[PDB]
Design a protein around this motif. Structure first.
Motif, mmCIF file in Angstrom:
data_model
loop_
_atom_site.group_PDB
_atom_site.id
_atom_site.type_symbol
_atom_site.label_atom_id
_atom_site.label_comp_id
_atom_site.label_asym_id
_atom_site.label_seq_id
_atom_site.Cartn_x
_atom_site.Cartn_y
_atom_site.Cartn_z
ATOM 1 N N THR A 1 -23.246 -24.182 6.519
ATOM 2 C CA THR A 1 -22.333 -24.572 7.614
ATOM 3 C C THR A 1 -21.469 -25.796 7.226
ATOM 4 N N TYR A 2 -20.171 -25.626 7.407
ATOM 5 C CA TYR A 2 -19.257 -26.659 7.164
ATOM 6 C C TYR A 2 -18.130 -26.486 8.191
ATOM 7 N N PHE A 3 -17.094 -27.308 8.081
ATOM 8 C CA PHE A 3 -15.851 -27.068 8.831
ATOM 9 C C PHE A 3 -15.003 -26.086 8.072
ATOM 10 N N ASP A 4 -13.834 -25.788 8.614
ATOM 11 C CA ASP A 4 -12.923 -24.810 7.884
ATOM 12 C C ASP A 4 -12.130 -25.497 6.809
ATOM 13 N N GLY A 5 -12.737 -25.716 5.655
ATOM 14 C CA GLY A 5 -11.997 -26.360 4.609
ATOM 15 C C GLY A 5 -12.892 -26.334 3.377
ATOM 16 N N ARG A 6 -12.366 -26.816 2.251
ATOM 17 C CA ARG A 6 -13.159 -26.768 1.015
ATOM 18 C C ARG A 6 -14.045 -28.001 1.093
ATOM 19 N N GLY A 7 -13.409 -29.178 1.089
ATOM 20 C CA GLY A 7 -14.058 -30.488 1.351
ATOM 21 C C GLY A 7 -15.344 -30.603 0.539
ATOM 22 N N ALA A 8 -16.362 -31.113 1.239
ATOM 23 C CA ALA A 8 -17.634 -31.465 0.605
ATOM 24 C C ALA A 8 -18.555 -30.214 0.385
ATOM 25 N N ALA A 9 -18.188 -29.035 0.942
ATOM 26 C CA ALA A 9 -19.012 -27.828 0.828
ATOM 27 C C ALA A 9 -18.631 -26.996 -0.374
ATOM 28 N N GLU A 10 -17.447 -27.213 -0.945
ATOM 29 C CA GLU A 10 -16.838 -26.152 -1.819
ATOM 30 C C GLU A 10 -17.645 -25.899 -3.096
ATOM 31 N N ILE A 11 -18.217 -26.953 -3.704
ATOM 32 C CA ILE A 11 -19.014 -26.723 -4.939
ATOM 33 C C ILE A 11 -20.274 -25.900 -4.674
ATOM 34 N N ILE A 12 -20.896 -26.154 -3.522
ATOM 35 C CA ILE A 12 -22.048 -25.353 -3.115
ATOM 36 C C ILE A 12 -21.627 -23.849 -3.055
ATOM 37 N N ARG A 13 -20.467 -23.538 -2.442
ATOM 38 C CA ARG A 13 -19.944 -22.134 -2.393
ATOM 39 C C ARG A 13 -19.744 -21.567 -3.785
ATOM 40 N N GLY B 1 -23.790 -14.980 -8.016
ATOM 41 C CA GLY B 1 -23.822 -13.621 -7.434
ATOM 42 C C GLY B 1 -24.619 -13.576 -6.144
ATOM 43 N N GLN B 2 -24.830 -14.725 -5.482
ATOM 44 C CA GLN B 2 -25.832 -14.720 -4.417
ATOM 45 C C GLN B 2 -25.080 -14.674 -3.102
ATOM 46 N N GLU B 3 -25.483 -13.764 -2.202
ATOM 47 C CA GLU B 3 -24.783 -13.701 -0.941
ATOM 48 C C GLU B 3 -25.318 -14.788 0.024
ATOM 49 N N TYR B 4 -24.423 -15.302 0.864
ATOM 50 C CA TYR B 4 -24.825 -16.332 1.843
ATOM 51 C C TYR B 4 -23.860 -16.226 2.995
ATOM 52 N N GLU B 5 -24.243 -16.693 4.191
ATOM 53 C CA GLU B 5 -23.296 -16.773 5.298
ATOM 54 C C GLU B 5 -22.473 -18.064 5.179
ATOM 55 N N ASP B 6 -21.164 -17.920 5.023
ATOM 56 C CA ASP B 6 -20.280 -19.061 4.882
ATOM 57 C C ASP B 6 -19.751 -19.410 6.281
ATOM 58 N N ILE B 7 -20.440 -20.296 7.006
ATOM 59 C CA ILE B 7 -20.166 -20.557 8.430
ATOM 60 C C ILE B 7 -19.187 -21.722 8.516
ATOM 61 N N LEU C 1 -21.943 -32.432 8.360
ATOM 62 C CA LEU C 1 -21.874 -31.204 7.561
ATOM 63 C C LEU C 1 -21.479 -31.634 6.187
ATOM 64 N N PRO C 2 -21.837 -30.854 5.132
ATOM 65 C CA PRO C 2 -22.437 -29.503 5.239
ATOM 66 C C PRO C 2 -23.962 -29.510 5.464
ATOM 67 N N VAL C 3 -24.467 -28.386 5.979
ATOM 68 C CA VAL C 3 -25.906 -28.155 6.090
ATOM 69 C C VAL C 3 -26.206 -26.753 5.527
ATOM 70 N N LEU C 4 -27.253 -26.668 4.701
ATOM 71 C CA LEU C 4 -27.691 -25.383 4.214
ATOM 72 C C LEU C 4 -28.948 -24.995 5.028
ATOM 73 N N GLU C 5 -29.026 -23.737 5.435
ATOM 74 C CA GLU C 5 -30.253 -23.245 6.026
ATOM 75 C C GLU C 5 -30.896 -22.193 5.073
ATOM 76 N N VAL C 6 -32.151 -22.407 4.684
ATOM 77 C CA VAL C 6 -32.793 -21.602 3.625
ATOM 78 C C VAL C 6 -33.995 -20.971 4.363
ATOM 79 N N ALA D 1 -22.073 -30.395 -12.442
ATOM 80 C CA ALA D 1 -21.186 -31.526 -12.732
ATOM 81 C C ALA D 1 -19.796 -31.029 -13.192
ATOM 82 N N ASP D 2 -19.754 -29.998 -14.048
ATOM 83 C CA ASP D 2 -18.478 -29.408 -14.528
ATOM 84 C C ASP D 2 -17.692 -28.921 -13.300
ATOM 85 N N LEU D 3 -18.424 -28.341 -12.366
ATOM 86 C CA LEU D 3 -17.702 -27.731 -11.217
ATOM 87 C C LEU D 3 -17.016 -28.840 -10.369
ATOM 88 N N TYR D 4 -17.710 -29.951 -10.041
ATOM 89 C CA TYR D 4 -17.081 -31.040 -9.232
ATOM 90 C C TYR D 4 -15.810 -31.567 -9.950
#
Ligand SMILES: N[C@@H](CCC(=O)N[C@@H](CS)C(=O)NCC(=O)O)C(=O)O
Ligand SMILES: N[C@@H](CCC(=O)N[C@@H](CS)C(=O)NCC(=O)O)C(=O)O
Lengths: 205, 205
Positions: free
Chosen positions: B6-18, B25-31, B50-55, B155-158
């Motif tokens: 869960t994040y807001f509608d933007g890349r911001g602080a969630a984007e590397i996790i996505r 290849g892992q599916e997740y709900e991008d809320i 946010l962001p928050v991951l639910e596992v 680290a490469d991704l950030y």
């Protein structure tokens, strides 16, 4: 395996790393550079800053990356992959809380002029209120007396040290947070920590 | 195992996790919560943010703690304990760099008024200069083209995402840092990332 930890002469951002070595029983060189010699060594540090850990000659910067590295070697990082992540989330929140009280800490430490009592009332205590409220929800959920799982992790160490130290000049810091006070007492009654707190160099920060 | 991010509608602080989920290849709900509904859900987040991951129903906050957790599950956190710590030190430095350019980012994002060009000249580019200089020393040492070890880590991704994105309006961002430019191109030629960058929702931040 040889460990060297370099910081300035103070507890500051290095102190939890020292306490992890203390709890582990692990010997390390506790290197404390003076202000005057700093410009001569700054260049040897990966990001020109302290603390830096050297592990058989290999340098690692960034106090939380170092604390995590040492905690994982010695069993204080959390007991399964999800608990490790909870421990990390709590130390990242603590870093946000530290960043939020910067204006207070700069004056309290003599690095800037300002109204210390006002900063305390307006910046420090409101920030500690939000941070202690989140930490207290973890302690209500754990019911072991530790923030995560059934035993001590370095998240417990950051919270107890910061609560105990701020308590020295901010007398009301535990007012309304009796779980936070009990946690700091519980962590500091650990016999290895308690002896390190008595024996460590006595510094202003 | 079910993942919800869960994040807001933007890349911001969630984007590397996505992007870590993308690479795995892992599916997740991008809320993605709207500004208007946020106050209704803020309470469900461990630190009201946010962001928050639910596992499988368990909540984890703090974008770097989440990225690390997912990267370790999928093999992008570093290949041995010391390399993991180097990866962590680099993401912690990146967080310092982000904190340092805050005054620039607040104006660029419309959250404050100010002189955008001046902030760029005085805050952003001098900060990127120091940060890119440290990252370039890592790339000179790796000689695989990645920051740490022989393959891609978060680290490469950030670094690539932030360099590629800032490059859109800061044309000179790679001037004097040809290793940084080559790294961003190398990371973004990863076929899974490249397709996610084309397919993801197109947002201002
Ligand atoms: N995010 C870093 C911050 C490190 C830091 O602030 N270091 C200061 C400690 S006083 C420093 O080395 N300042 C001296 C300088 O920047 O030259 C960490 O947690 O280790
Ligand atoms: N250190 C945190 C920062 C989280 C953060 O800044 N969250 C913002 C994203 S815009 C937020 O949720 N703001 C809404 C609020 O505070 O109510 C992280 O890295 O996850």
């Amino acid at each position: 395996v040889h460990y060297k930890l370099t910081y300035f002469d103070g507890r500051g951002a290095a102190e939890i790393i020292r306490q992890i070595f203390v709890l582990a029983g692990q010997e390390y060189e506790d290197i404390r550079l003076s202000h005057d010699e700093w410009p001569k060594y700054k260049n040897e540090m990966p990001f020109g800053q302290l603390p830096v850990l050297e592990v058989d000659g290999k340098k690692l910067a960034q106090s939380f990356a170092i604390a995590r590295f040492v905690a994982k070697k010695f069993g204080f990082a959390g007991k399964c992959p999800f608990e490790e992540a909870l421990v990390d989330s709590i130390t990242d929140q603590y870093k946000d809380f530290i960043n939020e009280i910067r204006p207070f800490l700069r004056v309290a430490m003599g690095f800037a002029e300002g109204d210390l009592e006002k900063l305390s009332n307006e910046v420090f205590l409101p920030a500690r209120e939000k941070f202690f409220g989140f930490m207290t929800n973890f302690l209500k959920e754990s019911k072991s007396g530790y923030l995560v799982g059934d035993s001590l992790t370095f998240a417990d160490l950051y919270l107890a040290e910061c609560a105990s130290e701020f308590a020295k000049k901010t007398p009301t810091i535990f007012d309304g947070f009796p779980e936070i006070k009990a946690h700091a007492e519980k962590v500091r009654s650990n016999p290895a920590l308690k002896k390190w707190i008595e024996t460590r160099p006595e510094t202003k920060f």
